[model samples]
Target: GRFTERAQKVLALAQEEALRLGHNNIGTEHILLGLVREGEGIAAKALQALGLGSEKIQKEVESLIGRATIHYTPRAKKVIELSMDEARKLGHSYVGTEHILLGLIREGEGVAARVLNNLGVSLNKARQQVLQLLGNN
Candidate 1:
């Protein structure tokens, strides 16, 4: 992903938190929690729109980060890389924050996606929003 300095800091903080919680690998959910806690930029805005608070997401992240074993899992890594590449190919200079949200949604069957869905942000809707944004630019 094309992480801004702030985003990089947030991800670093998340990785630290994950390690502190005994998680060996950082995943997308950790990144999502980071965005929520950082509370800035598009990622945070989208999270807020979904009625998910930093504290609540933090708790969920902690539980998942701790209980789950961490692995890059070839398929998982590939999906993320492909999403970033796709964003770049579309001429996005920084991959925009929305790409990360879409990437998470495309992964499917994750706590973050489930939470987003429960809050009425369907993957198709998100994709459509991205498509519209890209079209406008």
Candidate 2:
């Protein structure tokens, strides 16, 4: 497909999760769930390492958000759009997730980044993790 796939899926999941978490808009943390649940992808593995539990992370985010209103925060929206920008800049018309991850890092200060930092998932480590998997192919 010439279109972005996983990135779109992640967005959809993030939107769904926002509602599930009693929120009105997709925040960075909601976007995180989509990545975490992607299973075999680099994003998933990065979160899976070193005693990081997905559900545990989920619950932690829930605790952070508590009661919520839902919509894409402007900061979060830029990150989401950046995937498309990065993909284009990288000359990729197909394949995905890596750009989304990169966007996450560039976004740098969103709730997802905060949670990842609290859980010890550094940007370098997370990016390196993806690169490792990507390079093998």
Candidate 3:
């Protein structure tokens, strides 16, 4: 009820990333990767416009060597919370990839932020890109 179609796909793709890494916890890193993997969402577009792609981030994030009880990490959970709040702030009735991307930016301590910031995806720029895409859509 809370997530849009692309958002739901993001979660599934995030799980796939997590499973691939054999990570027991689903962290913001996985979600960030999923955002890119989804490939057709506002988040993906924003990232692409900012010079990011799924393979780019994937190669940068090198991975795991365990798989049981994969649960969202505390930081990951907080990102979801922030995503919902971002949706509310944007006056969206449901959460989408844009909100999730915003949440990753807001949750600056996560691995997602580390990779994104290192790659020059700043919060203000990403937000602007998102709004710009929404305007076009």
Candidate 4:
């Protein structure tokens, strides 16, 4: 399924938080933390209701990034660019949380996406859900 509305809201909030934190550009980790801290979006709330939070996910992201240390491998960068292009081509003025989620899925072999899959998140399902939600909107 696509990201739940709650997830999108949390993502927007996370983007705001990142900007407030002096981040020049929002990243996947920010989106992950956004889901965690907002705690209302399906993903965030589900994880939080199960006792997981942003800090935990943030730590995992940090660890993964530390091991990789290669931000935006070509394929990963392409995914992000494709997602953004998809958003713009679809006439969306801003890329939202769902787009970010979709971007990760499109990235395929990234640590972030892999970690999410290991945690039982289904990228295709999330994409479908996001499509459904957007359709309704």
| Tens-place lDDT digits, model 1, residues 9-127 | 55566566566666666666665666666666565666665567877776666554456355543433554565586557667656445555566666765656655555556777655
lDDT of each: 0.61, 0.73, 0.85, 0.56
Q: Which regions of candidate 2 are displaced past 4 Å?
A: 1-3, 49-51
Segments of candidate 3 deviating more than 4 angstroms: 63-68
lDDT order, best first, reads 3, 2, 1, 4
Q: What TM-score number comes out for model 1?
A: 0.67
Looking at model 3, report the run of 10 residues with the lowest lDDT sum: 59-68
* lDDT of candidate 3 over 1-137, digit per residue (tens): 39999999999999888888778788898998999999999999888988988898886665321243678999999999999999998899899999998888877777887777676667778778888998793
Question: 1 or 2: which has the higher lDDT?
Answer: 2
Higher-scoring candidate on TM-score, 2 or 4? 2
The TM-score-based order of candidates, best leading, equals 3, 2, 1, 4
Candidate 4 lDDT by residue in tens digits, 28-102 = 655566766775444454445444567767667655554211133454346556656556655665554555556
- Candidate 1, superposed: residue stretches over 4 Å from native: 63-76, 114-121, 125-137
Tens digit of per-residue lDDT, candidate 2, span 13-104? 77888898788878888878877776555666666763566687788788677864457988777887776676676677754766777678
Model 4 regions lying over 4 Å from their true place: 1-31, 34-56, 59-76
Over the full model, what C-alpha lDDT does candidate 3 score relative to the true structure?
A: 0.85
Give me the displacement of residue 111 in model 4, in angstroms: 1.0
RMSD of 1: 3.9
